[PDB]
Write a protein that binds this ligand. Sequence first.
Ligand SMILES: CCNC(=O)c1n[nH]c(-c2cc(Cl)c(O)cc2O)c1-c1ccc(OC)cc1
Length: 207
Amino acid sequence: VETFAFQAEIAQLMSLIINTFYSNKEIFLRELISNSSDALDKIRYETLTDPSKLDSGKELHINLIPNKQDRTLTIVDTGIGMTKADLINNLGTIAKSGTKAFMEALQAGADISMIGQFGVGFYSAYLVAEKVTVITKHNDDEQYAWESSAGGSFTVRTDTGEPMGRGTKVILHLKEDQTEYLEERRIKEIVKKHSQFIGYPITLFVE
Ligand SMILES: CCNC(=O)c1n[nH]c(-c2cc(Cl)c(O)cc2O)c1-c1ccc(OC)cc1
């Protein structure tokens, strides 16, 4: 297990997400599904010129898996995935510059729900999660698990035993008071409200 420090601006963005009073928490799901869609577009685009990019899985989809017993909500996609280097470099985002633009925007009237416009929507997972695990497999690398309970650091390790083939899985270990996000009717409402036109099938698993 390797332990990394978040760059200062990311640590500050995370602290802001965790500590700012902001009721409209549900937007985290739209931001994660939007990230899954972008990654799925990327593998789709690569496959248009190289069909073999799909040998690791032809199906392009997003699954939402709540688990009341573990208190987790997991989002799985069969997108391009990330290499170990992408994971370390802020989950493939331009987080340092994005965070600055997000800050400047906040001071100009913007609210937390606009996070995705600054390329750092991933971090909105911390509105509802005490811990986030990102398991990912890209065609050019092995399967890795990134993890962070915030606090200024994240870990990266090799992941084994449940190979995914290709894609990203985001496991949200929910805060005690945010279990509404495990409820079928609540998830469906949020998907319908914010993710109605996503170009990939979104399957909500039942328990
Ligand atoms: C190097 C190519 N890989 C990717 O771009 C990628 N792969 N998986 C993801 C991904 C990231 C998160 Cl946070 C997520 O919730 C879902 C994803 O598929 C992404 C991804 C990375 C950054 C993004 O910034 C908006 C959006 C999606």
